[PDB]
């Protein structure tokens, strides 16, 4: 049998064995959101179904294998997820937070949005918000406080989006996880120098960075910046 083991971050597991993969417990057993493999293992014994997490599809997953020291996503926390193209990555985040936590999924495009709504019924803890993240005042009613703000929006003005939402919705000392694509911002200069600018931009916005991770080999010219929100 595959030996599921705990991992440094709560809510994350590795089905270690002959074939070893990152894995999360399924919130809605008996179905896969996007065709990933599913593994169930008996624990005293009761079988608990799990879902495989593919790094190449989710950048949050690509962060884990890099060995991110601190992720503010953990069981029983409210999380704000920006740029919810579909449930490829949101479902896994919903798994980590668990029933006590909630996930506020924000998306703009209509066509992916209907896919996102199709999943949110299966996951009660996910609150889908189809709206543009550049005007957070629109969906202020539907969102509580959130311990973490994780953003995958690939926009040249993403830094503004984080600041606006974080000012409104992020708790003090909360989490901020940002996915940066160097090509979208400035393709002329090397991927490193683009990231240094984005770090500096966050600091002006009262966000203290903690650590930086490049996501090779999973994708090229991408990096995740993890910071904490110092309002004081």
């Amino acid at each position: 049998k595959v030996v599921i083991e705990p991992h440094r971050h709560a809510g994350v597991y590795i089905a270690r064995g002959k074939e070893d993969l990152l894995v999360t417990k399924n919130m809605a057993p008996g179905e896969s959101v996007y065709g990933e493999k599913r593994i169930s293992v008996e624990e005293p014994p009761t079988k608990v179904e799990y879902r495989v997490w593919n790094p190449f599809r989710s950048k949050l997953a690509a962060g884990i294998m890099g060995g991110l020291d601190e992720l503010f996503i953990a069981p029983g926390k409210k999380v704000l997820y920006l740029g919810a193209a579909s449930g490829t990555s949101v479902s896994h985040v919903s798994d980590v937070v668990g029933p006590e936590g909630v996930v506020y999924a924000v998306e703009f495009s209509h066509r992916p949005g209907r896919e996102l709504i199709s999943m949110a019924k299966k996951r009660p803890n996910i609150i889908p918000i189809i709206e543009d993240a550049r005007h957070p005042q629109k969906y202020r009613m539907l969102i509580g406080m959130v311990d973490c703000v994780f953003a995958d929006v690939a926009q040249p003005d993403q830094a503004r989006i984080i600041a606006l939402n974080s000012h409104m919705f992020l708790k003090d000392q909360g989490g901020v996880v940002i996915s940066i694509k160097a090509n979208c911002i400035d393709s002329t200069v090397d991927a490193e120098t683009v990231f240094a600018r984005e770090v500096q931009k966050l600091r002006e916005e009262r966000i203290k960075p903690l650590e930086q991770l490049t996501l090779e080999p999973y994708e090229r010219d991408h990096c995740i910046v993890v910071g904490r929100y110092m309002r004081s």
Partner: peptide
């Protein structure tokens, strides 16, 4: 909120 989010989501998508 979950119910209201779906209700607004269906309207915005013109479901």
């Amino acid at each position: 909120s979950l119910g209201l989010a779906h209700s607004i989501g269906r309207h915005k998508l013109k479901f």
